[PDB]
């Protein structure tokens, strides 16, 4: 079966909310036993728009990760209904509720591929992963590594971003009781983003180093691409130059200051003498 | 005593200044808020 019609995967805010909400609805499982559900969305496009998700009851044990239940029958019956809603809604792939992928996920993937025409395994997390994306999208690939590993079926990442639809986007604002200090439209928002940026870089940066250690000892298989990309980052380095700002901002501001002060200087004598007569008047006026 | 010496004059000022401070504090908060 094809996994083809993807080069990008955008995911709606609807997708995430549906999984936390659905956890209570089914059984109040709460990621005690990981859930896999259908991932619904558009087709006949290069880009993948994941419009929607619904849960399927799938419990995978915590004794063992090779045993699971996946409710097949629900998938065929839910199929006919999707057209009643809209004819752009078809089964694109499946969702994993995290916290992480498994080797076991290849086997879960073969069953789901029969239904889909463009299966993808997108891990939508029940916990939001950081302030970054709470979603990572992956696609099943047959590849060899020059680590002395013959043919494996594994998950290589494909770029994930968050998108929205015209109907949905409006609805999100109304619902929200946050105002956004992280809007990123203007200078005020932009300065916050820079502080956070540094913190983001640090969180990402640690992982890269532990991965390098694992290969060294605490043996882990080398994904060749990762090592190739790492070395590239260090070589571009140059040193800094210039950039500065003018005295001009102040000049304008001072201009405003003169105008008021001149108006004040004529007004002063008038305003200050009169005060005593009005003051007396006020106290008596107040009583009645 | 109860006529009005200098200590009674002390009590008067004290009383007003103290009472008045908590209310001035709410106004100080408004500037910050």
């Amino acid at each position: 079966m094809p996994e083809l019609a993807v080069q990008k995967v955008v995911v709606h805010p609807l997708v995430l909310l549906s999984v936390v909400d659905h956890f209570n609805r089914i059984g109040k499982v709460g990621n005690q036993k990981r859930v896999v559900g259908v991932l619904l969305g558009s087709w006949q496009k290069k880009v993948l728009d994941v419009s929607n998700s619904f849960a399927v009851p799938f419990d995978e044990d915590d004794k063992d990760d090779s045993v699971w239940f996946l409710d097949h029958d629900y998938l065929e019956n839910m199929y006919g209904m999707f057209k009643k809603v809209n004819a752009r809604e078809r089964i694109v792939g499946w969702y994993h509720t995290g916290p992480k992928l498994h080797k076991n996920d290849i086997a879960i993937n073969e069953l789901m591929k029969r239904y889909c025409p463009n299966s993808v395994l997108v891990i939508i997390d029940v916990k939001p992963k950081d302030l970054g994306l709470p979603t990572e999208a992956y696609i099943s690939v047959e590849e060899v590594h020059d680590d002395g590993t013959p043919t494996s079926k594994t998950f290589e990442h494909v770029t994930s971003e968050i998108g929205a639809e015209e109907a949905e986007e409006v609805g999100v604002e109304h619902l929200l009781r946050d105002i956004k200090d992280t809007t990123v439209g203007t200078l005020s928002q932009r300065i916050t983003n820079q502080v956070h940026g540094l913190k983001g870089l640090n969180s990402k940066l640690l992982d890269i180093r532990t991965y390098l250690e694992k290969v060294a000892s605490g043996k882990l298989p080398i994904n060749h691409h990762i090592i190739y990309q790492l070395q590239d980052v260090f070589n571009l380095l140059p040193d800094a130059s210039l950039q500065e700002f003018v005295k001009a901002f102040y000049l304008k501001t001072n201009d405003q200051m003169v105008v008021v002060y001149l108006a004040s200087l004529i007004r002063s004598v008038v305003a200050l003498h009169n005060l005593i007569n009005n003051k007396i008047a006020n106290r008596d006026a107040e009583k009645k | 005593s109860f006529l009005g010496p200098e200590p009674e004059d002390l009590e008067d000022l004290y009383s007003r200044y103290k009472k008045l401070q908590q209310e001035l504090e709410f106004l100080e908060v408004q500037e910050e808020y």
Partner: protein
């Protein structure tokens, strides 16, 4: 009856609200409808958890769309998942009619009422979901016997009791002759918010990014040239302006806003470009190094 029919202030969750707006939008002018899954507590609280939709048609809402087969079919799926939900009511979208309940829409609401005594009817406006204001209302049917004896303010008791006016015209007139409209509240949860607020891993480096000198230079050139033009104006302006009231000074110096303010606006735009570049310039070099 006036002695047990009260209005149902509907708490609408993110999963229902978004679903309904999207479904209507794509179909237009084909109208979509469906049953709403939720739970009923109080004698007036309905939380609308989630929705699924019924058959779209090119005449829109009709009797033909409503069959017990679709509903019955759904309920079997509800058991299998182990979701409990009973039916709270039904929804529809009218791009082709106003908020007033069309003659076929009342027929459809009566059938749905036989199944769940407490039934709600919702107009969605998919068209309005394109703009930044969205107007949607929920309603509840009122009985003919109820009107004469009770009168429509009986639905208003022991609940929120906000009665909606969706402009004048057909919408208001149809409201009055047909149903009682009741308000919308949004259910929210902290977790639900947190999902929405989330951005990107990539934005972390985005700010950091050292803005090209080239682009900066384009901005710098653009800023000094406007400034020079305005500078003159500024120079004439200061000879006068002995009086307060800055708007009057704007007519005098010519145009909306003072020329002093125009120069500052430009100085500030440059300042913003400069702020990202210079901060970024040192910051980048040190951290990777």
């Amino acid at each position: 009856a006036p002695a047990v029919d009260t209005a149902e202030q509907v708490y609408i969750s993110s999963l229902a609200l978004l679903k309904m707006l999207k479904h209507g939008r794509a179909g237009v002018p084909m109208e979509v409808m469906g049953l709403m899954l939720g739970e009923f507590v109080d004698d007036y609280t309905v939380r609308v958890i989630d929705v699924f939709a019924m058959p779209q048609s090119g005449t829109g809402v009709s009797v033909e769309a409503v069959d017990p087969v679709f509903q019955a079919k759904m309920l079997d799926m509800l058991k299998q998942t182990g979701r409990p939900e009973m039916v709270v009511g039904w929804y529809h979208s009218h791009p082709g009619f106003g908020c007033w309940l069309s003659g076929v829409d009342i027929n459809t609401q009566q059938s749905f009422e036989a199944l769940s005594e407490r039934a709600v009817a919702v107009v969605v406006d998919p068209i309005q979901s394109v703009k930044g204001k969205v107007v949607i209302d929920a309603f509840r049917l009122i009985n003919a016997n109820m009107m004469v004896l009770g009168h429509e303010p009986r639905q208003t008791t022991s609940n929120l009791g906000h009665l909606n006016k969706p402009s004048i015209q057909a919408l208001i007139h149809g409201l009055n002759r047909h149903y009682y409209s009741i308000t919308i509240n949004y259910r929210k949860n902290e977790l639900e918010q947190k999902m929405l607020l989330n951005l990107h891993k990539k934005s972390w480096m985005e700010g950091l990014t050292l803005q090209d000198y080239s682009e900066h230079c384009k901005h710098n050139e653009s800023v000094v040239k406007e400034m020079l033009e305005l500078a003159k104006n500024y120079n004439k302006a200061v000879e006068e302006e002995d009086k307060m009231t800055p708007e009057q000074l704007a007519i005098k110096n010519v145009g909306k806003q003072d020329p002093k303010r125009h120069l500052e606006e430009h100085v500030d735009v440059l300042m913003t470009s400069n702020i990202v570049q210079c901060l970024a310039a040192m910051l980048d070099t040190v951290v990777f190094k």
